[PDB]
Amino acid sequence: GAVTVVSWGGAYTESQKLGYGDPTAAKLGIPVNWVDYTGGLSEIKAQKEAGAITWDIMDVYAKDTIIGCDEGIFHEFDFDKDFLPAPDGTPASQDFFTSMPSKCAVGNILYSWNFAYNDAKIGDKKPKSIKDFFNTKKFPGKRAIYKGAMSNLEIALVADGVKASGAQAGGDLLYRKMEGAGIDRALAKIKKLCTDPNGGCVFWNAGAQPPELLANGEVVMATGWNGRFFNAQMEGTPLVQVWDAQILDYEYFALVKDGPGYADGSAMKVLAEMTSTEGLAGSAKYIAYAPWRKSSIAIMEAGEPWFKDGKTNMVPHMPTAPSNLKSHILMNPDYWADNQDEINEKWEAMKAGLHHHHHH
């Protein structure tokens, strides 16, 4: 019987299918099929409430491992019984480089939220900082920004000169500065960019939109996920990524309770093999997302050039390369799991106001 994995399409799903999905299906004799979505829990909630679940495994945002666990959508793992040790015998919990954010989470890769421009279209002056992303006088033109408040409020505050710490025990210090007053400042900063006649905003929802919008010259700068920009670069599009105030974030799989392959154990078997040392390392032959396991990282580093072509080194492109981390923010998934409803109400009211005050 087949197992249905839900992921984000384009270059990301491709990296998963080629790195670990197709090898897992061939090894186990369990077909592994891929469905595209754009994140969140609304589809799986609708399926669950209808008694008609067709999804088995979801590739999810960190915050959604927490929510989906708390809502009883996802299965609570027994981590070292359910997931495979490293080849040398290291238990999975010691191989995954840090702890899980929820009992329902198993890591796959790490990624960055950053931004890019089209070097062939931007002109002689070249963006270099998150402040440049917001600077409509030096860099006039439309921006593409993410449809949701998450990530936008962080970069807005850093562009306003509020300091992030990057990773440290307890999470990024930026989040303590994102109470009501800080949220209001961040909303005002985004509203300012989007209302500026020399700015303006396109809200992107799907991972391929930022590179496409830049390739077509529809915006001068776009936030996005670094692996999507990387894919476009390797296809020859002259994008340049800017890593100032990049947000380092962690991605996961979760197992859907009562999906087609749940009771018979087939979905768990697929999940354990996809998240193996070899599987997670294999995905990084295709896209610049870093494996969650120390064992997989070591394989990639020893095997450079690790890209599929046998000549492009992948380490300098990774979210975790020291050069790319110089001014990073560490995503806090508890903050967004706890506060996204309250924040989203204000965010969507701001977006609705952009339209209501817009003159054709």
TrEMBL record:
Q: Which cysteines are joined by disulfide bonds?
A: 69-104, 194-201
Residue positions annotated to bind glycine betaine are 228, 289
**Name this protein carries in UniProt:** Spermidine/putrescine-binding periplasmic protein
